[PDB]
Design an enzyme around this catalytic site. Structure first.
Site, PDB file in Angstrom:
ATOM      1  N   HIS A  51      -4.364   9.957   3.564  1.00 14.56           N
ATOM      2  CA  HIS A  51      -3.164   9.233   3.204  1.00 14.56           C
ATOM      3  C   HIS A  51      -2.695   9.483   1.762  1.00 14.56           C
ATOM      4  CE1 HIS A  51      -6.005   6.190   1.463  1.00 14.56           C
ATOM      5  NE2 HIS A  51      -4.993   5.963   0.649  1.00 14.56           N
ATOM      6  N   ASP A 101      -9.149   9.703   8.667  1.00 19.11           N
ATOM      7  CA  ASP A 101      -8.420   9.652   7.400  1.00 19.11           C
ATOM      8  C   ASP A 101      -9.137  10.474   6.323  1.00 19.11           C
ATOM      9  OD1 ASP A 101      -6.982   8.993   5.042  1.00 19.11           O
ATOM     10  OD2 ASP A 101      -7.412   6.881   5.185  1.00 19.11           O
ATOM     11  N   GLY A 193     -12.700   1.510  -7.517  1.00 21.41           N
ATOM     12  CA  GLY A 193     -12.433   2.779  -6.875  1.00 21.41           C
ATOM     13  C   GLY A 193     -10.974   3.019  -6.606  1.00 21.41           C
ATOM     14  N   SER A 195      -8.130   5.091  -3.765  1.00 22.28           N
ATOM     15  CA  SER A 195      -8.024   5.532  -2.393  1.00 22.28           C
ATOM     16  C   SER A 195      -8.585   6.934  -2.493  1.00 22.28           C
ATOM     17  CB  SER A 195      -6.576   5.677  -1.989  1.00 22.28           C
ATOM     18  OG  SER A 195      -5.999   4.442  -1.582  1.00 22.28           O
ATOM     19  N   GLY A 196      -9.281   7.390  -1.451  1.00 23.40           N
ATOM     20  CA  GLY A 196      -9.848   8.726  -1.451  1.00 23.40           C
ATOM     21  C   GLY A 196     -11.023   8.961  -2.391  1.00 23.40           C
TER      22      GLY A 196
END
Ligand SMILES: [Ca+2]
Ligand SMILES: [Zn+2]
Lengths: 248, 94, 309, 251
Positions: A51, A101, A193, A195-196
């Site tokens: 994403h 994802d 953190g 995303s990813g």
């Protein structure tokens, strides 16, 4: 004050310790902006969430970064050529809970691997972690919306939550798949953190392995009891990862 | 100027009043910074909303988990604005 | 553009360009158009209303306001077009020509100038005004919720930070108070139309109460004719009916205010689009929207004209 | 005059807005403006002399700085061997051009350099003053698309056919009604996926006992639906403006 002396304190990661961390940035009005975390898994390849890719944008990844507000000489900037992104073919932006994802970005010029920048260690295919496994997230806190972002790389102890502990109706229910890892779920926060970003776990060897790829968190916040940060199990995607790197 | 890279406008459809109260239970959540283009109404009507990139995945799974259907109307809002702005420039004179 | 015959109607303009257009049109058709300033916006910008007339003193009139939610850029641009339309068709089109001989049309192209100025410099999707409150750091109020019509009641927010913030009190905003003053003082207003976007809708009172208006029948019929006529040009479809039943309960809106003021013909149009583009309607659709919307508007004016009261 | 060294097509075989035989309509130019450093194409035009391009009036913004791009096929390139970029000297817009009504959408671009006039830079032919072509006549609207914008651009020079629609037909109240005037050429037929291949001010190409004549300059349409049934592409009638063209050609 010009260059203020470097102070590692609080939840700052030890400088360069998480040496496979990467920063995926998009271009805008001439300048790039950090948007996601990622892990350098090959000399000229990076793995991040699916994403995090917007096909209509110019990307670059930054390697050897710690303090995003200060050039330190270790940073390496790699422009990501138009078609070098590589989202999984099964990733569907309309079913986040469906998983798959993940995505990979081939670097335009290869990483200069050294003491300060290093390749991550991927788990063996289908490999699975035990409940309460002591893993560490790392990132610049973009998962957190209500406040200002860290300049320095942060970290947190997010012990994993096994499937049958992460599936229990009052946690992440039928939304969690066998292809995902859950970490945290208690008073310990998950907001450090991106995303990813990586869910690094201490292998049976002493070395660390990138077990996860941050996918999503609760609508209510990146620190909600019974709703642990869901990651994509990078082991379930070992076959895929390898060919992509191979075939391209 | 505002940054909209990666934002998305979604078309939620709350089948019945119940599905409507739950999309509203997401409106109270100030931290998400939702921009309701076609805020909640009678069930059946469309609910268009621009959900920022950081609240993107969390909003979706919230929706998915509640069995509420949505489709993506606009995939990347900054790119539209980028076109608009480019047309305006291409067409400027006194 | 050095004339209004070379002004580009097929793009989106800045507050300035729109203000300079009003000046040429006026300077060009001195006998037909006049630019009135009804007040100043919170940040000091003048608020103009263009008056289209042929003569007489205090003839019945039509009110048309656009751009009250500034992000809805298709309304200002179609407002500029309606301006040119009015001056091209008078003394050529018998339906309109007949209207400008008995009544006056007041056109407010940029009802919220600060908000509009803000969408070009800072936040394209900004929709509120730009006032500041003592009890909050969030700026603005939903001007179309600030009217004295079921104000404060459900269908509006009381938190200065919400996009549907009703403001401290009815007419507390100067953009709204300016019109309230002008309209009330004039007194000879028979129609009141407010253009918005989007949803492709044509609504009539009420938005707050579930209570029916004394003449739903007539207004409703006017709606089908106008929706009908608007469809002629290209088939685009509008749905119609009263606000509350067609959308949701909304508190403090203009047409509920107008209507209670006795301006029987009160309607709100929700221009193009359906959601594919929403507020970011591509420029290629400015003229087309302008044209079809014109047809449905003429119908209302024409009805007004035949039913003067 | 309008004779190419790269034979284009006709209603040969390709269905849908054909790409285009690289260099098969050598009077096709791309009008570009500068923004920061990059040049971007806005309109199409026609080469008609080694230094004059006919183009639409609505394609001119008194504020922009233009350049004319000659001998191309793929916009995302800057060499293609037989290609060029020439500055403009003067743009004479028709003094009766009317924006609101979109009447007399024409403009003549007096270039600034000789323009080599080589093997891929060729001058189309101007119609005969008055020519009112037969309804249904096969003509081709070339261009890089950029008209309706929202669709995978067209880095590849496109080209597709348009059937002259007679004025008598266009002017039908339920067609383009009054909007149209005998000074306009209509074209475009019931489509099939459509995909606007010609740009604003693009050329309406037609053969005349061999050679091709520029019968039109792309002027207007519907906005969202390029090639709507009963809503053809309206072009400007080059023949109706031969004296003007000839008067400004000498300025
Ligand atoms: Ca740094
Ligand atoms: Zn509005």
């Amino acid at each position: 004050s010009r260059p203020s002396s470097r102070v590692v304190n609080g939840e700052d990661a030890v400088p360069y310790s998480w040496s496979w961390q990467v920063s995926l940035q998009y271009e805008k009005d001439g300048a790039f902006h950090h948007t996601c975390g990622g892990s350098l898994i090959a000399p000229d390849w990076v793995v991040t969430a699916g994403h995090c890719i917007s096909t209509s944008r110019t990307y670059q990844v930054v390697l050897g970064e710690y303090d995003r507000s200060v050039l330190q000489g270790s940073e390496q900037v790699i422009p990501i050529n138009a078609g070098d992104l590589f989202v999984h073919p099964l990733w569907n932006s309309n079913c986040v809970a469906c998983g798959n994802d993940i995505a990979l970005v081939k670097l335009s010029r290869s990483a200069q691997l050294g003491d300060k920048v290093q390749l991550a260690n991927l788990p063996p295919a289908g490999d699975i972690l035990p409940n309460e496994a002591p893993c560490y997230i790392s990132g610049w806190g973009r998962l957190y919306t209500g406040g200002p972002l860290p300049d320095k790389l942060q970290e947190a102890l997010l012990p994993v939550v096994d499937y049958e502990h992460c599936s229990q109706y009052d946690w992440w229910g039928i939304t969690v798949k066998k292809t995902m890892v859950c970490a945290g779920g208690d008073t310990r926060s998950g907001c450090d953190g991106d995303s990813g970003g990586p869910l690094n776990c201490p292998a049976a060897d002493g070395s660390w392995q990138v077990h996860g790829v941050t996918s999503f968190v609760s609508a209510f916040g990146c620190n909600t009891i019974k709703k642990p940060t869901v990651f994509t199990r990078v082991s379930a995607f070992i076959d895929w990862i390898n060919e992509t790197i191979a075939s391209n | 100027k505002e940054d909209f890279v990666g934002h998305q406008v979604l078309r939620i459809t709350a089948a019945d009043e119940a599905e409507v109260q739950t999309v509203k239970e997401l409106e109270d959540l100030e931290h998400l910074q939702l921009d309701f283009w076609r805020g909640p109404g009678q069930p059946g009507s469309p609910i268009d909303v621009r959900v920022p990139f950081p609240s993107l995945q969390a909003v979706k799974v919230f929706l998915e988990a509640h069995g509420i259907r949505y489709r993506i109307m606009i995939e990347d809002v900054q790119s539209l604005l980028d076109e608009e702005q480019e047309q305006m420039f291409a067409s400027q004179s006194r | 553009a050095r004339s209004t015959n070379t002004f580009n109607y097929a793009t989106y303009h800045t507050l300035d360009e729109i203000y300079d257009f009003m000046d040429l049109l006026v300077a060009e058709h001195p006998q037909l158009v006049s630019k009135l300033q009804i007040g100043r916006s919170y940040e000091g910008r003048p608020i103009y209303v263009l008056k289209f007339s042929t003569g007489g003193s205090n003839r019945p009139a039509i009110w048309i306001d656009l751009g009250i939610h500034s992000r809805e850029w298709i309304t200002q641009a179609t407002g500029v077009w309606f301006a040119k339309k009015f001056t091209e068709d008078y003394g050529q089109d018998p339906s309109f020509t007949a209207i400008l001989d008995s009544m006056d049309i007041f056109l407010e192209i940029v009802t919220n100038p600060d908000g509009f100025a803000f969408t070009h410099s800072q936040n394209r999707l900004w929709r509120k005004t730009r006032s500041v409150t003592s009890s909050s750091l969030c700026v603005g109020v939903d001007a179309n919720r600030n009217w004295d019509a079921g104000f404060g009641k459900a269908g509006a927010s009381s938190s200065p930070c919400s996009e549907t913030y009703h403001g401290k009190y009815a007419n507390s905003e100067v953009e709204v108070k300016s019109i309230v003053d002008f309209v009330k003082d004039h007194g000879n207003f028979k129609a009141f139309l407010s253009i918005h976007s989007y949803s492709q809708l044509l609504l009539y009172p009420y938005g707050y109460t579930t209570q029916s208006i004394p003449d739903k029948t007539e207004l409703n019929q006017v709606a089908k004719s106008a929706v009908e006529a608007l469809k002629s040009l290209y088939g685009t479809s509008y749905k119609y009916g009263s606000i509350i039943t067609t959308i949701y309960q909304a508190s403090g809106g203009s047409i509920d205010w107008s209507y209670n003021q006795g301006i029987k013909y009160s309607f709100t149009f929700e221009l193009r689009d359906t959601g594919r583009y929403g507020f970011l309607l591509p420029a290629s659709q400015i003229i087309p929207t302008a044209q079809e919307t014109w047809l449905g508007v003429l119908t209302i004016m024409e009805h007004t004209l035949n039913n003067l009261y | 005059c309008g004779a190419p060294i790269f034979q284009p097509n006709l209603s040969a075989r390709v269905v849908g807005g054909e790409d285009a035989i690289p260099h098969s309509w050598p009077w096709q130019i791309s009008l570009q403006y500068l923004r920061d450093n990059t040049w971007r194409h806005t309109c199409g035009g026609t080469l008609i002399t080694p230094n004059h391009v006919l183009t639409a009036a609505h394609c001119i913004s008194n504020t922009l700085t233009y350049r004319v791009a000659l001998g191309k096929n793929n916009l995302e390139v800057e060499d293609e061997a037989g290609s060029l970029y020439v500055g403009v000297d003067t743009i004479f817009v028709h003094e009766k051009w009317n924006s609101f009504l979109v009447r007399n959408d024409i403009a003549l671009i007096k270039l600034a350099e000789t323009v080599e006039l080589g093997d891929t830079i060729q001058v189309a032919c101007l119609p005969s003053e008055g020519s009112l072509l037969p309804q249904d006549y096969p003509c081709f609207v070339t261009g890089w698309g950029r008209l309706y914008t929202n669709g995978p651009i067209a880095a590849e020079l496109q080209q597709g056919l348009q059937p002259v629609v007679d004025y008598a037909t266009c002017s039908q109240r339920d067609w383009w009604g009054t909007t149209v005037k005998e000074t306009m050429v209509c074209a475009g037929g019931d489509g099939v996926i459509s995909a606007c291949n010609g740009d604003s001010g693009g050329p309406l190409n037609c053969q005349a006992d061999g050679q091709w004549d520029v019968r039109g300059i792309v002027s207007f349409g519907s906005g969202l639906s390029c090639n709507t049934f009963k809503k053809p592409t309206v072009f400007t009638r080059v023949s109706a403006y031969i004296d003007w063209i000839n008067q400004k050609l000498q300025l």
